[PDB]
């Protein structure tokens, strides 16, 4: 059929792609440079989609095919087509190459591909077993070049079990895997393992253990930008739930900055929602461009209403906002922070008063913030002066809030500190760029 | 700081050029 022949052609092109990736893996192991395995994994997400039964059937018929347990393991889980007319024997290894065992990296890549296909087919149980087998056989291996594919397979195994709605049978095993990766000095594998452990804790609400792990473990600096963004989001949630609001805001802004341009909509949605909540708690009204964006508009609409209520200062509006979308906030895992905002709303008003006025009288500030009595205003203002929200100094002798006089920052040292940080970053970037330089062997 | 930014940009451009040269040589190898 026309559709069938088109599918066969796409399968053949995918087979050519996998052959190219396996050749790259072999060249990487020969040259001991991750670059090639990194590119193979980079192409992996694209190949994850656009795969049917015959695709992987032909891949297993051509690759491997040594009568090994893999063929008797995945094939019983994946159907087999009839005698295809275009029986092109996809055999990159010919004669001696076929006899030689498949390279550990290449075999791991093929097992990862089959596991991804099982994921996309919702064969949760079969992917379970195939992932255990591949993980066990990769655990024995100790080649450095295998570590990146090991990290990818680790992440996909955690994902398969996450769809298994258990995500606890993995806790100890991923802890052990991450610890071994840390011992081995691996970077990508330990990065993915730490991110996945943090994700599991955040799912099951074990915040304290996650904070302990983040405090003790150290994330390698030379990690993937996407992995860094995921870790930043997880650490931002940990900090925000733990009352380190400023650090949470900074970390989540960094995570948003490091997001993959336009590749992951959902991660951006969640980061924006949590950042909006944290910023509202910290006393800053968030930017409207986020709410106006096309992809994030409908997702953040309840947060837009919440920000409206907070800025306007109408506690009743906040209550009706919670009534309509309270369950949505809960399902988003931000209900507790929203309640904290409900009881901290006065911080935004105090911050606005601090920005506007410089010597506001206590009675007038109490009137403006709809407080009942001036003494409550004094209490709230002092609490704000600690909370990093205001920089004033109450003069209780005459009861007026005297904001600190602004000073010429340039004549002070802060510009030197900012320039030092930026110059250090620039010099480090230059050193890193000239450091690799990928000079070929003559 | 401006000099450091210029140096970093030049180094990054040189790294990009060298990487593209290496990739082109490898591709033309086979």
């Amino acid at each position: 059929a026309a559709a069938e022949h088109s599918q066969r052609e796409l399968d053949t092109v995918t087979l050519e792609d996998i052959k190219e990736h396996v050749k790259q893996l072999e060249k990487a192991v020969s040259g001991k440079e991750p670059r090639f395995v990194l590119r193979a994994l980079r192409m992996l997400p694209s190949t994850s989609r656009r795969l049917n039964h015959y695709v992987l059937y032909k891949a297993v018929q051509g690759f491997f095919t040594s009568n090994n347990a893999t063929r008797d393991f995945l094939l019983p889980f994946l159907e087999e087509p009839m005698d295809t007319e275009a029986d092109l024997q996809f055999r990159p290894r010919t004669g001696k190459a076929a006899s030689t065992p498949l390279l550990p990296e290449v075999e791991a890549y093929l097992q990862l591909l089959v596991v991804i296909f099982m994921m996309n087919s919702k064969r949760y149980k079969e992917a379970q077993k195939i992932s255990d087998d591949l993980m066990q056989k990769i655990s024995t291996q100790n080649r450095r070049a295998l570590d990146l594919v090991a990290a990818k397979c680790y992440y996909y195994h955690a994902r398969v079990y996450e769809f298994l709605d258990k995500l606890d049978v993995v806790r100890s095993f991923l802890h052990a895997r991450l610890r071994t990766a840390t011992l081995r000095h691996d970077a990508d594998g330990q990065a993915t393992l730490l991110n996945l452990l943090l994700r599991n804790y955040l799912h099951y609400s074990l915040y304290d253990q996650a904070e302990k792990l983040v405090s003790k473990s150290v994330f390698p600096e030379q990690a993937n930008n996407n992995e860094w963004a995921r870790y930043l989001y997880y650490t931002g949630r940990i900090k925000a739930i733990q009352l380190e609001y400023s650090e949470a805001r900074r970390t989540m802004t960094n995570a948003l900055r490091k997001a993959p341009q336009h590749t992951a909509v959902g991660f951006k949605q969640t980061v924006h929602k949590l950042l909006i909540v944290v910023e509202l708690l910290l006393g800053e009204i968030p930017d409207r461009l986020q709410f106006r964006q096309p992809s994030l508009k409908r997702s953040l609409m309840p947060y837009f209403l919440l920000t409206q209520a907070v800025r306007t200062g109408n506690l009743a509006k906040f209550n009706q906002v919670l009534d309509q979308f309270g369950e949505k906030f809960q399902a988003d895992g931000t209900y507790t922070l929203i309640i904290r905002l409900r009881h901290n709303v006065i911080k935004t008003g105090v911050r606005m008063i601090s920005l506007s006025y410089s010597r506001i009288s206590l009675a007038d500030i109490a009137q403006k913030l709809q407080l009942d009595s001036p003494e409550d205003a004094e209490f709230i203002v002092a609490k704000a002066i600690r909370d990093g929200v205001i920089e004033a100094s109450i003069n209780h002798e005459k009861g007026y809030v005297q904001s600190k006089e602004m000073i010429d920052i340039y004549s002070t040292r802060e510009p030197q500190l900012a320039f030092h940080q930026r110059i250090s970053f620039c010099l480090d970037i230059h050193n890193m760029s000239v450091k690799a330089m990928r000079f070929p062997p003559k | 700081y401006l000099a450091s930014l210029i140096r970093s940009v030049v180094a990054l451009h040189n790294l990009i050029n060298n990487k593209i040269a290496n990739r082109d040589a490898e591709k033309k190898e086979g």
Binding site: P34, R35, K258, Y357, R359, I360, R422, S433 | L5
Partner: protein
């Protein structure tokens, strides 16, 4: 260019759509007279359904029959041109059919007919005229995508080849759309460019064009350009001599007569509320004009008591205090209020400090870009 579609009809429809003026009588009579004279049956039905009016059975049937027989005559002429006359005759017949389709208010049919005429039209000038007709239709209906695509097409046609008159008309059309999209800077630029040789009398008379130009220029242009291009502009001054209110409003800001400026600004807000193009942006225009006036007053002062500025603006101390606090909270005015002593202190950054802030911001952006590039390439 042809007056069809008549933007006055769209303005009247919007005015009736407004809550207060929904029951207006004179606008009702004007719109009904326009519909009857122009015989817009589809437009009449759409307006009746939208405004919940009582459809006149006799008038509606008469208009429908007139539209039907006119369309039949146009189709007969098109068939005659197709059979006997050449390509030019058929193109003109289809152009007339599309023109009458726009006459009655059939948006979809008129647009499709104009598209067919454009497809069958070879002359560049006629293609530009078709684009102008579609742009006028879009303005009448406020179809953002249609107006944007057709403006791009008209720009391309002019770039390939175009007379100066078409360029001026397209400049005025872009200015009107920009005013409707709230990009007041481009509106001011285009309108100030075209005010000298305003030849697009179909969209709006010259007095309305000068009023719009003054409004958008004051919302966009700064004081030096405002003086050089609006205050001393011969055309704008000549037109304003016939519009005392607009002249007073414009001169209040430049001459520093703030109470009269606020009176004129209230009048202008009321006028724009009814206007069909400035209606969505009237609140923003008034807010930005007030912010501009406050900043202009504060530019020459470092610490002015709230009482003095309240007297200057002809408003109470409490109102000016509240408005100044609101505008400071949004980071628009560079001042900090001192309620106990009732003194407003301007905190305008020194040139060195502002330059340091700008360099910090731009360098942070560039460093983020460089870090992303390094991460992407280094693998």
């Amino acid at each position: 260019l042809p007056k069809n579609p008549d933007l006055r009809i769209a303005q009247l429809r919007f005015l009736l759509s407004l809550p207060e003026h929904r029951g207006d009588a004179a606008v009702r009579d004007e719109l009904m007279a326009a519909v009857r004279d122009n015989n817009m049956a589809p437009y009449y039905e759409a307006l009746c359904k939208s405004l919940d009016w009582q459809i006149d059975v006799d008038l509606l049937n008469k208009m429908k029959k007139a539209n039907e027989d006119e369309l039949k005559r146009l189709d007969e002429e098109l068939e005659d041109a197709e059979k006997n006359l050449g390509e030019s005759e058929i193109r003109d017949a289809m152009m007339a059919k599309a023109e009458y389709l726009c006459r009655i208010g059939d948006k979809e049919g008129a647009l499709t007919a104009f598209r067919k005429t454009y497809d069958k039209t070879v002359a560049l000038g006629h293609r530009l005229d078709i684009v102008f007709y579609l742009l006028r239709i879009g303005l009448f209906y406020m179809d953002n995508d249609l107006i944007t695509r057709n403006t791009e097409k008209a720009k391309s046609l002019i770039e390939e080849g175009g007379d100066w008159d078409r360029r001026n008309r397209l400049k005025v059309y872009q200015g009107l759309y920009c005013v409707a999209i709230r990009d007041f800077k481009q509106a001011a630029e285009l309108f100030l460019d075209t005010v000298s040789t305003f030849t697009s009398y179909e969209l709006m008379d010259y007095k309305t064009f000068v009023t719009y130009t003054v409004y958008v220029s004051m919302i966009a242009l700064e004081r030096p350009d405002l003086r050089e291009k609006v205050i001393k502009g011969a055309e704008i001054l000549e037109v304003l001599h016939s519009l005392p209110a607009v002249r007073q409003y414009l001169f209040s800001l430049y001459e520093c007569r703030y109470s009269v400026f606020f009176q004129s600004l209230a009048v202008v807000e009321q006028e724009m509320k009814k206007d069909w193009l400035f209606a969505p942006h009237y609140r923003y225009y008034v807010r930005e004009m007030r912010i501009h006036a406050y900043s202009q007053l504060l530019e020459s002062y470092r610490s002015l008591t709230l009482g003095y500025m309240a007297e200057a603006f002809g408003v109470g101390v409490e109102f000016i205090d509240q408005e100044l606090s609101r505008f400071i909270a949004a980071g628009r005015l560079h001042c900090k209020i001192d309620k106990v002593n009732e003194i407003v202190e301007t905190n305008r950054p020194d040139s060195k400090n502002w330059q340091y802030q700008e360099t910090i911001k731009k360098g942070d952006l560039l460093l983020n870009r460089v870090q992303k590039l390094s991460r992407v390439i280094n693998m």
